[PDB]
């Protein structure tokens, strides 16, 4: 296979950074066997069998992770890394910039729908099939979601496999002696020196080593945990049982060696034409090593406990030197799948329709919202708007992502029906953007009725917009509350429905995309 060729070439080029870690991995497995509550491993295992999990299920997982991370010596530390010209060339850093940007889009498109969700209700045959095809790639009110959680950033890094845990769970849960588990994984590792073990390989191994019957081979790397017995998990643990063999799983990184490692990876990339793919789902060898090494400047990126790490690899490793990309568009198109095209949808803008600076759409029934900004072109008019309506400081918009207006409007589902307050302006912007299919309801609240819930809305949802800093005034002058497209949708809807309800809203766009 192509994939094993990349793996073997990466194994030769990085041989020097590999280490002999069997002793430590077995010591950690021994510390878990003495210290961990395996009924709580079984409890997490039950919770992962559930098609739909909540924050109560996440706490049980996070808490088990922390208890494992306390018992073990192989731990990765929070180590952010800035890459600069030197060991890496100017060209090296540009290639790495592009690859991490592509990987960013790949991982978001794979993981984010597990929590953001994909609408699967009243839709065409064509749409449902495409959506099912995406759901099958990534291991997954008519919205399909696996995690129903308040803070999705708490899923980050809680799902990784660890050889010491796999070894300790195979022993205790499998009911065999540690020696018998190491034997089995050692044998699996041996195969792994020459090929990636297939179901035919496990089947044959399991005849001499019964413990490996716990591995379900028709399973997958996705949507599972460090407590599940994937072939991926065993193959990694088996690769640690070697001491020698140039196994990638054994590599150590420090800030002393991170640049050199990446440089060697880049050598293999150029030689074999490795790439980040644009398909969500399972990672090729390169996508894998890059993701892992970038997660932390200090650790064993393949085999350490990583459950304490906050941040994404593209956040923890950055490149430095002195519209949306295709990768960003793909991300966005996928994010939009959360929308119910049949649901009540509000829209509101700040700025004139020819030059909007804040756009928002809201669907009250599910609670999802689109919110983003735009640099104004006509600065003169923006200053009057700041003073009289939105109090946004033009300098604050500098850190926003451009290109969103065209791309979001372009991807609004067909024949969708949008409610607003003063349809006149939205029509103009929708028309300027190429969407005359979108039908509008104009609601015509009076000024005083439209703002009945203004204070109610800011009280609940203030943390959802920080853009409005300026003192805003109206002539009789009196100080007023600034106008935000988002709060305006929310408050107008509450005004129509005579009441504002208490529950989380769900941001349709990743924040990693509203801002650069
Ligand atoms: O909320 C989430 C997000 C992601 N995941 C799942 O976690 C996976 C992260 O898998 P890892 O990136 O942690 O790779 P790994 O350490 O386990 O090493 P390998 O086994 O891949 O060789 C992702 O592929 C995703 O499907 C969840 O289970 N829940
Ligand atoms: Zn706002």
UniProtKB/Swiss-Prot annotation:
<dbReference type="GO" id="GO:0039548">
    <property type="term" value="P:symbiont-mediated suppression of host cytoplasmic pattern recognition receptor signaling pathway via inhibition of IRF3 activity"/>
</dbReference>
<keyword id="KW-0167">Capsid protein</keyword>
<dbReference type="GO" id="GO:0019029">
    <property type="term" value="C:helical viral capsid"/>
</dbReference>
<feature type="binding site">
    <location>
        <position position="358"/>
    </location>
    <ligand>
        <name>Zn(2+)</name>
    </ligand>
</feature>
<dbReference type="GO" id="GO:0042802">
    <property type="term" value="F:identical protein binding"/>
</dbReference>
<dbReference type="InterPro" id="IPR000229">
    <property type="entry name" value="Nucleocapsid_arenaviridae"/>
</dbReference>
<keyword id="KW-1113">Inhibition of host RLR pathway by virus</keyword>
<dbReference type="GO" id="GO:0039696">
    <property type="term" value="P:RNA-templated viral transcription"/>
</dbReference>
<dbReference type="GO" id="GO:0046872">
    <property type="term" value="F:metal ion binding"/>
</dbReference>
<keyword id="KW-1224">Inhibition of host IKBKE by virus</keyword>
<feature type="binding site">
    <location>
        <position position="465"/>
    </location>
    <ligand>
        <name>Zn(2+)</name>
    </ligand>
</feature>
<dbReference type="InterPro" id="IPR038115">
    <property type="entry name" value="Nucleocapsid_C_sf"/>
</dbReference>
<dbReference type="GO" id="GO:0019013">
    <property type="term" value="C:viral nucleocapsid"/>
</dbReference>
<dbReference type="GO" id="GO:0030430">
    <property type="term" value="C:host cell cytoplasm"/>
</dbReference>
<dbReference type="InterPro" id="IPR001680">
    <property type="entry name" value="WD40_rpt"/>
</dbReference>
<dbReference type="GO" id="GO:0008408">
    <property type="term" value="F:3'-5' exonuclease activity"/>
</dbReference>
<keyword id="KW-0694">RNA-binding</keyword>
<dbReference type="GO" id="GO:0039724">
    <property type="term" value="P:symbiont-mediated suppression of host cytoplasmic pattern recognition receptor signaling pathway via inhibition of IKBKE activity"/>
</dbReference>
<keyword id="KW-0862">Zinc</keyword>
<keyword id="KW-0899">Viral immunoevasion</keyword>
<comment type="function">
    <text>Encapsidates the genome, protecting it from nucleases. The encapsidated genomic RNA is termed the nucleocapsid (NC). Serves as template for viral transcription and replication. The increased presence of protein N in host cell does not seem to trigger the switch from transcription to replication as observed in other negative strain RNA viruses.</text>
</comment>
<feature type="binding site">
    <location>
        <position position="348"/>
    </location>
    <ligand>
        <name>Mn(2+)</name>
    </ligand>
</feature>
<keyword id="KW-0464">Manganese</keyword>
<keyword id="KW-0687">Ribonucleoprotein</keyword>
<feature type="site" description="Important for exonuclease activity">
    <location>
        <position position="425"/>
    </location>
</feature>
<keyword id="KW-0479">Metal-binding</keyword>
<keyword id="KW-0945">Host-virus interaction</keyword>
<comment type="similarity">
    <text>Belongs to the arenaviridae nucleocapsid protein family.</text>
</comment>
<keyword id="KW-0946">Virion</keyword>
<protein>
    <recommendedName>
        <fullName>Nucleoprotein</fullName>
        <ecNumber>3.1.13.-</ecNumber>
    </recommendedName>
</protein>
<feature type="binding site">
    <location>
        <position position="488"/>
    </location>
    <ligand>
        <name>Mn(2+)</name>
    </ligand>
</feature>
<comment type="subunit">
    <text>Homomultimerizes to form the nucleocapsid. Binds to viral genomic RNA. Interacts with glycoprotein G2. Interacts with protein Z; this interaction probably directs the encapsidated genome to budding sites. Interacts with protein L; this interaction does not interfere with Z-L interaction. Interacts with host IKBKE (via Protein kinase domain); the interaction inhibits IKBKE kinase activity.</text>
</comment>
<keyword id="KW-0378">Hydrolase</keyword>
<dbReference type="GO" id="GO:0003723">
    <property type="term" value="F:RNA binding"/>
</dbReference>
<feature type="binding site">
    <location>
        <position position="468"/>
    </location>
    <ligand>
        <name>Zn(2+)</name>
    </ligand>
</feature>
<feature type="region of interest" description="Binding site for the cap structure m7GTP">
    <location>
        <begin position="48"/>
        <end position="224"/>
    </location>
</feature>
<keyword id="KW-1139">Helical capsid protein</keyword>
<feature type="binding site">
    <location>
        <position position="350"/>
    </location>
    <ligand>
        <name>Mn(2+)</name>
    </ligand>
</feature>
<keyword id="KW-1090">Inhibition of host innate immune response by virus</keyword>
<dbReference type="InterPro" id="IPR035083">
    <property type="entry name" value="Nucleocapsid_N_arenaviridae"/>
</dbReference>
<keyword id="KW-0922">Interferon antiviral system evasion</keyword>
<dbReference type="GO" id="GO:1990904">
    <property type="term" value="C:ribonucleoprotein complex"/>
</dbReference>
């Amino acid at each position: 296979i192509k994939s094993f060729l990349w793996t073997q070439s990466l194994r030769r080029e990085l041989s020097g950074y590999c280490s002999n870690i069997k002793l430590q991995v077995v010591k950690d497995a021994q510390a878990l066997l003495h210290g961990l509550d395996f009924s709580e491993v079984s409890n997490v295992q039950r919770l992962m069998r559930k098609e739909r999990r909540d924050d109560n299920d996440l706490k049980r997982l996070r808490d088990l992770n922390q208890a494992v991370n306390n018992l073990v010596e192989l731990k990765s530390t929070q180590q952010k890394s800035i890459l600069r010209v030197g060991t890496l060339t100017s060209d090296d850093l540009l290639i790495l910039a592009a690859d991490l940007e592509k990987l960013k889009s790949k991982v978001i498109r794979t993981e984010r729908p597990l929590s953001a969700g994909v609408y699967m209700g009243n839709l065409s045959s064509q749409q449902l099939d495409q959506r099912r095809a995406l759901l099958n790639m990534i291991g997954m009110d008519g919205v399909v979601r696996v995690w129903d959680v308040k803070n999705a950033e708490l899923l980050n890094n809680q799902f990784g496999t660890m050889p010491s845990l796999t070894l300790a769970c195979l022993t205790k849960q499998g009911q065999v002696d540690l020696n018998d588990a190491v034997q089995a994984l050692t044998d699996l590792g041996l195969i792994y020196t020459a090929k990636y073990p297939n179901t035919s390989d496990l089947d044959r191994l399991t005849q001499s080593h019964p413990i490996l019957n716990m591995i379900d081979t028709k399973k997958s790397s996705l949507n599972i945990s460090g407590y599940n017995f994937s072939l991926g998990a065993a193959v990694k643990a088996g690769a640690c049982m070697l001491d020698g063999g140039n196994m990638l799983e054994t590599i150590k990184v420090s800030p002393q060696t991170m640049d050199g490692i990446l440089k060697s990876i880049l050598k293999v990339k150029k030689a074999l034409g490795m790439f980040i793919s644009d398909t969500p789902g399972e990672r090729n060898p390169y996508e894998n090593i890059l993701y892992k090494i970038c997660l932390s400047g200090d650790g064993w990126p393949y085999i350490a406990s990583r459950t304490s790490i906050t941040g994404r690899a593209w956040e923890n490793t950055v490149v430095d030197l002195e519209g949306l990309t295709y990768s960003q568009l793909m991300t966005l198109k996928d994010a939009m799948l959360q929308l119910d095209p049949n649901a009540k949808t509000w829209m509101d803008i700040e700025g004139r329709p020819e030059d909007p600076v804040e756009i928002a759409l809201y669907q009250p029934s599910s609670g999802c919202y689109i919110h983003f900004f735009r640099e104004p072109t006509d600065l003169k008019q923006f200053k009057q708007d700041a003073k009289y309506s939105h109090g946004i400081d033009v300098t604050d918009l500098f850190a926003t992502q451009p290109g969103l207006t065209s791309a979001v409007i372009d991807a609004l589902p067909r024949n969708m029906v949008i409610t607003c307050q003063g349809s006149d302006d939205i029509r103009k912007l929708l028309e300027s953007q190429g969407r005359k299919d979108i039908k509008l309801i104009d609601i015509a609240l009076s000024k005083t009725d439209s703002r009945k819930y203004e204070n109610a809305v800011w009280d609940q949802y203030k943390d959802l917009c920080h853009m409005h800093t300026g003192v805003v005034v109206e002539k009789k002058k009196e100080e007023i509350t600034p106008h935000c497209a988002l709060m305006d949708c929310i408050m107008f809807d509450a005004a129509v429905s005579g009441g504002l309800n208490t529950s989380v809203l769900r941001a349709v766009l990743p924040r990693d995309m509203v801002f650069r």
